[PDB]
Amino acid sequence: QKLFVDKIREYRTKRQTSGGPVDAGPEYQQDLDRELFKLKQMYGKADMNTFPNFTFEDPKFEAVEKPQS
Amino acid sequence: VKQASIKQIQDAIDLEKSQQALVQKRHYLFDVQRNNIAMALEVTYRERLHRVYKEIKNRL
């Protein structure tokens, strides 16, 4: 369990990292940006803080001349 | 003369029946036309009502 305790210590040290998910990873920023761009492209254009408002109209059937008794 | 008389009376009878159908047909069709006018109007508000919630849910 002592090896497991050492693993727990390493996990705790990673937890206390002030930079959080930095890990000294130069490609972490690039990978995160690529993932975000892919997610945005898949979901399409959107706004982080906005509401959906729209209006529409429907024209009924136009009158057609028809004479009869 | 008998043939002439029977032809006249049957002509009168069939004209009476034709007018009996004719008087009914006009208002019978007009009522259904008015009813269909209401039918055409139904689906207006449903489109917006259904789409707005879907758009907001997609935003979330």
Nearest CA in chain A to B38: A60
Contact call for B56 and A46, based on CB within 8 A: no
List the alpha helices (DSSP H) in B1-60: 2-40, 44-59
Interface check B40 vs A, CB under 8 A = yes
- Method of determination is cryo-EM
Residue environment code for B6-43, b if the CB has 16+ CB neighbours within 10 A, otherwise e: eeeeeeeeeeeeeeeeeeeeeeeeeeeeeeeeeeeeee
Header resolution in angstroms: 3.0
The whole-angstrom separation of Cα B15 and Cα B52 is 60
**CA pair distance A46, A43, nearest whole angstrom:** 8
Quick check: B41 and A69 CB within 8 A? Answer: no
